[PDB]
Symmetry: C5
Subunit: 216 residues, 5 copies
């Protein structure tokens, strides 16, 4: 009745207060810096190898790219906000890391909504589905040992001193791989790498996605 | 004359009033939550199987995806708003559910305008036409029993505790299927599913679209 | 000199005034409603059949879709506005009808600018050029009687009670059809249809575009 | 040092002032009208014939389309604005003519930035690079006399009474034509046309681009 | 604890302040002018020749185009801004040069985020990854000496008097070229050119990218 109508409205107002307080908070966050670095955790759920174009050495993957990070400026005490512990918000409403594939051949295509999940400890979780075309020579995919390809993912403009990458595991998550794909996965790994260049002190970080695959 | 000019102006003003009141209403709705959950009803009107690419196992569907939900914050009393019972508004003017195909291979393409219909009880109806490419192996489509493919539709970020899905029927609406398509439909179902993994104290809900099809006779 | 520099400035000011008056007018129009219905006139000038894909039963047309309607809220007296009788404005600056093809297979592509022409009686004319891919089986296009295809056009969310459609004629305008197209037109008609749905007491209107074509002889 | 830092700042402020004065000027220009007509000058620099699709009779051109017009409302005295004689501005910051190809088969693709150059006499120069697909039958391109194609360019909604077109020359500029294209140009002309129709007692103006081409030898 | 949570807050406030000061600074920069010219440094890191279409003479490159320039208006003293020496910002938040390929056949595709890095001396670094389709005849790529193609890059609307170009080296950076590409690079150069045009006493600059490639063996 009216009590339960006012009780829905109360819970709505609490979320509106939280979001309004979180967005309008002063220094509205200017990205990671040296004095204020950040760790982004990457994982891949690999869904399909759609296409292996051997006349251009381009390979087409569909995956979920799972991103995680934690900002002090997204922290709150659930006790002050009607026991709310997490909310969904548009990814355009918040800073997100600029994680890019280093060797793509077409602009990445986003397959899912751009929505992130924020939790009271200030951790954000963003898991967009993408189709990516990248440089990969599929020679020997028609054979038993198959073909092997790699693509690096990392920040585009931030060094290791601003954004650090990590994985929870070396194993690309294959539990959602399309059972009836044209190509089967022999192995898929995601490995953290630290590079260097004697032009410069900065560590440069990436996650190296390596797939071994062959025809069904 | 002037009276029926003033009479059209009157009805316009009423709608303007309703829309302005509805949009400016305080807590301007922040999405479904646990304390304020929502049920979305899904239905499919399947129009065409356009393409079955057997060299990539991608299949191309054109369907109307019909979405329904009800918000208290979209309720009004027609008596207070010149007997207006429903209005059309741009889908960008209102919250809409984030219902996505789980196994698409290309971004979905929208074929129709993005316009929703709102009714005085607070129910919204949104029926976009889409072309979807999804993972589907068409082997045996050239045979009599045909090929079978499935795609799940569900919220992208909301659990069953926030958004619940339901169908009005298991039967995908085939009354608009292109009579002269390259492929004919042997059956098409839409089934509600609840999944429970040992991770999450929340259930997840989805609608499983399953089509059996073959090359035209 | 200065007087015909001022005269051009004057004429500019008058248009500025008209547009500013017209845009700022209170109830800034909320779409057609039952109490305030509208009639949209449709016409097709068919330019080219570009492609007939027989492996997917998709056909590609290029046409001019001519749209017409009249709003009281766009009326003015030219005498009050320096004898201005009509103006061009961006189509995004005004309400336009949501006329869609019901059986497209790809989002329509707009080939022309989105600009409408408004006349003092309140009538708007909007004529976008489009390339449309729609469901059509081209079997027999390689023969003498050719192939026949149809596509319905109509509002996406408005019933006949809100938007009525009408044509000026049954003949699709073929005077601009590409002389050297791969396909020649045997006939092209545009026919008004009144459809009803079992859920819904109100009439729906569409215009049914029917083309008979064959490969160039 | 500080003086030529203050110098650069001064020159920046002058441009700022000019642009701010030019944009904020009252009647902020409402397009050409009968009492305030305009002449647009068209020229084509033809770069490449990329593709001649003989199975759809579509031909793909890459050209620079050079546009010129003059507005009183863009005039200034360089003496009042620190001797500034011209500035670059985004094409979206100013009115531009709605010059379209009448027989395209795909939306035109813009290859260059959308930036115009404005000069103190009020003349604007806008030269976008484009790829255009248009209706053209390439039969005989494989022969010595080659194939001939034409496309008309003109305003979409403005008559000759509002926008007049003109060319500086009949010769399409071929000095930038890709030396190693698959197709060589035998001739390319751009011709002004006045079309009188029966419906409408007003000049319609267009520029007719006519290309004769054949496969490279 | 609280102190190193306040420290992080302090560091954030400092960058907030810097950006806010730099953005709000009066004459908010109007582009390079004759009195206030600019030098853009161009470099190419060539990643892959993906495709050589010999039926249309189009070639597809993927590269990193590295851009550099320096504005007085982006200068700051790190001492006033908590020793901050550089910041990342969206490329849409700042002026960027309009560097275009002069002979592309499709709009360039951007593969990377549009983010620039600004340093206290006022220098900006912007390095977008791109796929470009440009006019190039691949005859002899199937031979030992291979094929040679060229494309000019430069400002679209700015002369040498406003934007000058320069390279750090004549060698296109090949250290990131895809080891297993369909085509291998025999040489790749980037050369500054001063172009003189018939209309125009101001010189125009470009960087000429010249690639010699062949099929891998």
């Amino acid at each position: 009745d009216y009590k339960d109508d006012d009780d829905k409205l109360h819970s709505q107002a609490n979320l509106m207060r939280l979001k309004s307080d979180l967005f309008n908070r002063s220094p509205m966050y200017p990205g990671p810096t040296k004095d204020d670095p950040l760790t982004v955790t990457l994982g891949f759920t690999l869904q399909d190898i759609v296409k292996a174009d051997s006349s251009t050495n381009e390979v087409d993957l569909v995956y979920y790219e799972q991103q995680r990070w934690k900002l002090n400026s997204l922290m709150w005490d659930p006790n002050e906000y009607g026991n709310i512990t997490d909310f969904r918000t548009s990814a355009a409403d918040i800073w997100t890391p600029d994680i890019t594939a280093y060797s793509s051949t077409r602009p990445v295509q986003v397959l899912s909504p751009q929505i992130a999940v924020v939790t009271h400890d200030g951790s954000v979780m963003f898991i967009p589905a993408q189709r990516l075309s990248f440089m990969c020579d599929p020679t020997g995919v028609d054979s038993e040992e198959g073909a092997t390809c790699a693509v690096k993912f990392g920040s585009w403009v931030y060094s290791g001193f601003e954004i650090d990458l990590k994985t929870d595991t070396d194993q690309v998550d294959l539990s959602s791989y399309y059972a009836s794909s044209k190509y089967e996965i022999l192995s898929a790994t995601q490995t953290r790498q630290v590079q260097h260049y004697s032009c410069c002190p900065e560590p440069y970080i990436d996650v190296n996605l390596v797939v071994k695959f062959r025809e069904r």
